[PDB]
Model the fold of this input.
Amino acid sequence: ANFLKNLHPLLRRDRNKKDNQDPNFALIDALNEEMNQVEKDAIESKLQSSLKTSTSEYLDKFGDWFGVYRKTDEKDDVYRARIIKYLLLKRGTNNAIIDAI
Amino acid sequence: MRFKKHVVQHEETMQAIAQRYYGDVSYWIDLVEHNNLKYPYLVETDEEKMKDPERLASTGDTLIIPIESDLTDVSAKEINSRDKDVLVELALGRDLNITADEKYFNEHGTSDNILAFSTNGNGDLDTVKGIDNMKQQLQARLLTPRGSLMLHPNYGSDLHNLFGLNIPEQATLIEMEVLRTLTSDNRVKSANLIDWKIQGNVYSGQFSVEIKSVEESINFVLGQDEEGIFALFE
Amino acid sequence: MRFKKHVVQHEETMQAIAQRYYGDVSYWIDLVEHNNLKYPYLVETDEEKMKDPERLASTGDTLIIPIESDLTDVSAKEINSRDKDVLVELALGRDLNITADEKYFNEHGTSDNILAFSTNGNGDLDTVKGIDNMKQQLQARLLTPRGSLMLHPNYGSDLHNLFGLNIPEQATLIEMEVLRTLTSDNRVKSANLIDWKIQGNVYSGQFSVEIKSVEESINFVLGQDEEGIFALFE
Amino acid sequence: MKTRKLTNILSKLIDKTMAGTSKITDFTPGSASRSLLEAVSLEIEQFYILTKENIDWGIQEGIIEAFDFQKRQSKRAYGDVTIQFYQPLDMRMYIPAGTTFTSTRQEYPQQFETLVDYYAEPDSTEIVVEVYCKETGVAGNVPEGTINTIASGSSLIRSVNNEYSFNTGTKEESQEDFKRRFHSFVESRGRATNKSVRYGALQIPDVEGVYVYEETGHITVFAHDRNGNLSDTLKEDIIDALQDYRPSGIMLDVTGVEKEEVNVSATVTISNKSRIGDTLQKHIESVIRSYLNNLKTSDDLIITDLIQAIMNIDDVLIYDVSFDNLDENIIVPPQGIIRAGEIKVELK
Done:
């Protein structure tokens, strides 16, 4: 969101008093809105690259890498908890069998 | 690839066409072979052409002459005045008008937030072409401080620092800086001082700018046909 | 080793800094890597910098630009007048004032036990700097007989023997000896006669001495930065 | 990344542009504003697409990095060479590591060498040695009867032969094959289970398949390499890898699969008799070798399957096929496997 900063210095950055319908300010604010929205989306994208904070599609990618597939109507929180539990399954003892049952 | 196309003229012959283009009548048989014509090559009117439309051509029909033509090496004298106007317009480029409202940024030349886009009155963005384009670009370069523009250290001018004393020396500095800024443009063939004066605070000067001639712009644009870009990355 | 240090300016960007110093915006990623900055490189104010003080920089924070800077090859025009004064003062050296009480050793120039140390009024030894230093050294050389100083046969002057007759010849001898004594100083770029006269007993003359210019002294001192001595062993 | 598309971005830009000013009202094709906004939105679309792709790549890379589960490189081929002498050796002979073996068959010019020192006992007439292809990848999978030259030059040697086709050379591990081994890792985090034993046995890259045969208080791990053999070094390595995974207190044993060695002789008729030659014979032989040496543990051999595999090479050119050594399908038990013996083809 450095679009106004790196813009050509002579162009106006502010809607001109002489005309409320200044098309230059309209175009500039439009482009600035898209720049800031893309920056927002890029900042929020970090949550998809972590198992802790991943959501639907990327969480399904993680579960496909771990081997665990989403059930019918299975939300993200319970699904990630199920993946984490599936990785940490004790096996080979009475307590493990009792928990599995 | 490009080839010449000839319109059959009244009571023309293939021998005359061959002499006219190839400079020898001997190529008339090649012209027949390439165009696939039957013996009455150039019929009098379309009633005869109805007998065999495929293999005959009438008056006003277009023939193809397979000679490799090229738009460069063409005598500018043939080119129509409108065609020359369009060619120089292409050469000097089309750009979005920003130097509208001359009075405002003439009242505040050294400051920022001085110029802005505008509309052409037809709900589309305004555009300056040819001489108007050159005016816009030269004004913008002169007005831009040097090194302020991103990705372009050398674009601009040092006039914002030349607000010095009232002596001939600063006048000469201003003149030299202005000549440097004008010479920086590739399209400006040369620039030179006309007259200047000092009225205490106020300095006044005027310059003469010779843009590239019609012939050079025509040659440049017709050469560009080989690439098909028809655009300016100077 | 020395490097440039940049203070973040209001609403500055890394691309602008890279263009300003490296002459190309492409080095902004190198600038980030060297300074270890997170994505919002130049925050608006210190409230944002509180969120991550290590990895963010705000306005008024100092960045490091690893370009090998050197104090020589710097345009003297940038240097401040006080800085130039201090540089020429260093160039021409600081020494303990001995030529105090000008009247006394001017009344007895040829004799010994003529000059002595003095105090600066602040309980420290008196010191002469710059032009005062040059005055002291030139007076002392002129007054010192040649060969009398230990460890320095050639330092001094032969004026003590030039108390000859009243004719132009002895005048010329005095003038030549004075020019030799002044030329012996490395800092004296040249010396030349101005005017002289003879009033029977008394001879009178005056000279013009051109010390090394500000530019030369600045270049010498800034070159000395590479060694760090900042002292004079001429 | 929300996976926006070009049309919505352009519509949003044009709507805001109209809302900021009533002067701009020409957004038709060929207009300057529309072209500029189109280019901007296209670049935004490409940025979003590439960001999605890079995030997918980053997820695979973080999976690889976190567990240090490095992907399998190409394996160099290896197999067994037999040697015969003129007469039973009077003495302990020697063959050093790096002794080269080559083949005069120009169709398979690859080279092989010993990685181990060998000796023979007095009064022995032949010896077997294991040789590795110098070059990695599939190139070292020569057929049986290829290697016939020894570069040691020793006079006592009568003849040299690889009795079986090499099959252990392979290229880089495929995407799905890597993905399946990682699932086995995840399952085998619980050490003492049957799948964990199978993973520990498969932890050695040389091992091809494993069948864990389970009894009360006893475990038998049938394992094999990509040739169907199980060398003592490989058995020891499997054992050492299973120490961490096998259950404590239960007996465990490692043994080689029940390998079956199918020789084939096929009489094939050809419609276009000009095509007869050495190329067609060698191509058919190659196809048969590839079919048999792709059989897994417990795959039965079905003669009609082999017939269709041979005939699908060219259904017009090939007329009829007949086998001179096979008459009935071969049943393979769970711990068994089939591998190609001598493959021969007669063109008629």
Q: What stands out?
A: The CA atoms of residues 224 and 230 of chain C lie 6 Å apart. Chain C touches chain B through six residues (CB under 8 Å). The two ends of chain C are 27 Å apart (CA to CA). The longest strand of chain C covers residues 188-199.
